[PDB]
Amino acid sequence: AKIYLASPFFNEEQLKHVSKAEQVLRDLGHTVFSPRENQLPEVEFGSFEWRTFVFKNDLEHIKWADITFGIIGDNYDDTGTAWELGASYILGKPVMLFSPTGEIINLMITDSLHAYFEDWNDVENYDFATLPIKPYL
Amino acid sequence: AKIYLASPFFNEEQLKHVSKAEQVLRDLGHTVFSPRENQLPEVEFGSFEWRTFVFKNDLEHIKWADITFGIIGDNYDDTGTAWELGASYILGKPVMLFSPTGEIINLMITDSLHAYFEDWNDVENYDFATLPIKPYL
Amino acid sequence: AKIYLASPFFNEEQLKHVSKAEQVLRDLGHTVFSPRENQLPEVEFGSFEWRTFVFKNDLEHIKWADITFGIIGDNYDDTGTAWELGASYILGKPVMLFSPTGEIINLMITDSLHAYFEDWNDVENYDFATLPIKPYL
Amino acid sequence: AKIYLASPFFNEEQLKHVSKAEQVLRDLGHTVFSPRENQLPEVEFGSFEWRTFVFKNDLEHIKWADITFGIIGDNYDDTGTAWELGASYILGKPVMLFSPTGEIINLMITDSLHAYFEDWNDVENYDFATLPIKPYL
Amino acid sequence: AKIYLASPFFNEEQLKHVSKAEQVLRDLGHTVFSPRENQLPEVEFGSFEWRTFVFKNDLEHIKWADITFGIIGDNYDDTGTAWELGASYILGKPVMLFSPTGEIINLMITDSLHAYFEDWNDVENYDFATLPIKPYL
Amino acid sequence: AKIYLASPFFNEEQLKHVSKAEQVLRDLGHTVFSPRENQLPEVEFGSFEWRTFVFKNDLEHIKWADITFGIIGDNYDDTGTAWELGASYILGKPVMLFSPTGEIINLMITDSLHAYFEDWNDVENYDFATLPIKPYL
């Protein structure tokens, strides 16, 4: 499948999780769009133009993807990821979530997920072809 | 206009801002759905029935609304609100955002909003009929 | 509210229920599109032109409506109505359903409705402005 | 392609048609989601929770599919299938319909189809890659 | 109704038709967003900021509108207008079209419109509340 | 990928560009739907029925496609193509545009594109798998 990796990527622990998710999913044969690899170094970093193109390229890759794969733990920086999960739900993309902390996530996110994971071995054995439901409970 | 009020309401400070938003928008004549008034009275709290009905009722009222009015502050509790603004954007609802702090906001949210406010008198003078653009700058 | 009245209208009993729905919803001040009043006067009945315009006009009026109000009974004629409720749900129109029989209804319909009624006085007291949830239980 | 099989599956004749459709389409190399194979025996059959998850998993597989393949004859149990065909149309999925009775189907269904079949040999020779229109007439 | 006025406004003749449309639709009591009044006062003309805000404000006002009212004439300048009618159609906005010339129109546009006009008195008598179909013939 | 080729095809220069686009994209392994190859010679050319089925089959192939690939130059016949680009944008399809004249195209089109090309060698080296943004500037 084509997967949009929705996760922050600004500190060491966030990068650990994104890096692993890139590795697990790509090693399964999936095409993963990971926003940290597309910083758009063609316009001025942080300009209005840069903000606009980052948004447009990320949103257009959520629409391009088959599945949105999110990562949310306790690094309370989840506002961009949360937005992209909500957008993905309305766009009709199956939403998957990996939580490293295994904590309690907001109702709107958990109720919208199609598959929820807390260990990478379960992602590695999940049937992306038939896409079985694995709800948060 | 019909307005969905997207905001956390889980501690005293968040409740203060929600209360002011309800009062301001309703005194302007708008019909406001405020999720805190719709915690359902009373399916057992936290049951599967309760989680389902709250999610479904909330989402249906985003769909019913003309405009989604969000409150984003210093909260690190903005996960569900951020999700509701992403859903709203895909659903084609104009997003208005109020920030009690005036801090920097994630670019997925700032690039998705139609009008941005940092004072309630600015909301009180906004032309809801014509919906002029009021971007985050 | 603008209301699309989804119901069969092909025998005397179905016509009775449609007529009562028209009267009740219109006496409440709502603007009701009733497909039986829009059989088009008169492109040749059953022509390709007639089939096209009726389909297009009906679907456009589901899109124009705020709410789709359906009548599901003992009809085994509910095919087009059921189709219109599925379309309505994806289009983000709140679905209200009235069942003259109170029998068991398919779970794709019951899990898609926002308000369920078995008596017209309950419809007469429903708050259309706030659209409270009234689930099938 | 990925195909959602929309059909009842509760009596012998309905099961005959679903079984054949599973067989024909899968033998062509398509990935078929057939709701009768996913009864969700992880929660209590018939509970509110079961109804909710069946709806969510079926709807999420319509969104996952490329094409919705319906079966409608004269076994007047078509209300769930009709709903899913209407949803599929608004979601933008090409809708295909196989009718064993070859009778007259409601306007909203026939006008929404992309391909209509009355014999399995025609499905077996249809070009799913180019998806030519084969309208009901 | 809220109406998005889709039309070029780049020479004297196009401006004449836009002006008459504004006057007619506003004298009927409608709330009209007219893109020529929203060239933004004044982000630098033609800047990236200006191109972004105009696009975003225009699209947001198509989403805000109940109806998109288009003017298609002898213009070979109808590119953006044609784009806005295609977007409108997918967004589920009923499309009304006025042609100052009465010439032949592309079938993607004629097969997407809900009401077609060649005289302003016909627009003045149109029932906007019920939105009757008025096809291009 | 599956690509919808949005372009006029009525004069020699338009046919040159469509023919080349068919050739380049298909030689890359993409499945291209080109409307000129599907004239529907099963009903009467130019009838109402023909106009209806051409629209339905073209729209249904835009929805079937992964990407919409447009061609717009100075052959001012772009009203159907413009419509299909606007529809494709709202449907969530990445929009690509090849311009032979390399001129100035309307704001709504250029701002909506994901990839813009003026030479076929660039299309031949573009990564359709990762779909990088190549904006008009």
Side-chain angles (χ1 to χ4, degrees), chain D residues 111 113-114 129-131 137, chain F residues 49 53 56-57 60-61 64:
Chain D
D111 255 13
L113 308 171
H114 187 74
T130 64
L131 203 90
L137 253 168
Chain F
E49 186 165 4
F53 277 133
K56 176 179 174 59
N57 191 45
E60 262 156 23
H61 275 86
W64 183 237

Side-chain angles (χ1 to χ4, degrees), chain A residues 48 50-52 54-55 58-59 62-63 72 76 78-80 82-91 105-112 135-137, chain B residues 4 10 48 50-52 54-55 58-59 62-63 72 76 78-80 82-87 89-91 105-112 136-137:
Chain A
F48 175 83
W50 176 85
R51 287 179 85 82
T52 303
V54 167
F55 176 84
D58 286 0
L59 222 211
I62 297 168
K63 293 170 164 182
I72 289 179
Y76 311 117
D78 311 286
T79 207
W83 191 99
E84 313 177 312
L85 300 184
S88 301
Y89 181 66
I90 304 300
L91 290 165
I105 295 136
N106 178 274
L107 181 135
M108 310 304 281
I109 283 185
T110 69
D111 255 13
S112 65
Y136 174 93
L137 253 168
Chain B
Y4 186 92
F10 315 135
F48 186 81
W50 175 89
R51 105 180 199 170
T52 306
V54 164
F55 182 86
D58 283 0
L59 190 53
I62 303 181
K63 286 156 178 190
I72 289 285
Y76 96 114
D78 283 337
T79 315
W83 188 101
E84 296 172 333
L85 301 167
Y89 182 72
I90 305 306
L91 288 166
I105 298 172
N106 188 281
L107 65 84
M108 303 305 294
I109 290 179
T110 72
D111 289 275
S112 317
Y136 174 96
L137 299 175

Side-chain angles (χ1 to χ4, degrees), chain C residues 97-113:
Chain C
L97 195 73
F98 181 88
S99 176
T101 79
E103 281 167 29
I104 283 146
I105 298 172
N106 188 281
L107 65 84
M108 303 305 294
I109 290 179
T110 72
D111 289 275
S112 317
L113 63 84

Side-chain angles (χ1 to χ4, degrees), chain A residues 94-116:
Chain A
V95 182
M96 314 203 290
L97 184 74
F98 182 89
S99 162
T101 65
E103 186 144 27
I104 300 94
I105 295 136
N106 178 274
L107 181 135
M108 310 304 281
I109 283 185
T110 69
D111 255 13
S112 65
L113 308 171
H114 187 74
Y116 173 73

Side-chain angles (χ1 to χ4, degrees), chain B residues 91-111:
Chain B
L91 288 166
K93 313 293 192 188
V95 167
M96 290 158 99
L97 195 73
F98 181 88
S99 176
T101 79
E103 281 167 29
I104 283 146
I105 298 172
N106 188 281
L107 65 84
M108 303 305 294
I109 290 179
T110 72
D111 289 275

Side-chain angles (χ1 to χ4, degrees), chain A residues 13-63:
Chain A
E13 203 91 309
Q14 292 169 349
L15 271 203
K16 170 181 150 222
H17 300 142
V18 181
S19 180
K20 183 60 168 162
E22 291 163 351
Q23 162 235 299
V24 161
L25 298 171
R26 286 173 171 158
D27 287 343
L28 294 167
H30 300 291
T31 290
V32 172
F33 178 76
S34 186
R36 74 174 183 136
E37 299 162 340
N38 315 85
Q39 299 192 348
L40 301 181
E42 212 276 299
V43 284
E44 308 187 1
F45 295 95
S47 59
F48 175 83
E49 186 165 4
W50 176 85
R51 287 179 85 82
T52 303
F53 277 133
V54 167
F55 176 84
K56 176 179 174 59
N57 191 45
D58 286 0
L59 222 211
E60 262 156 23
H61 275 86
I62 297 168
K63 293 170 164 182

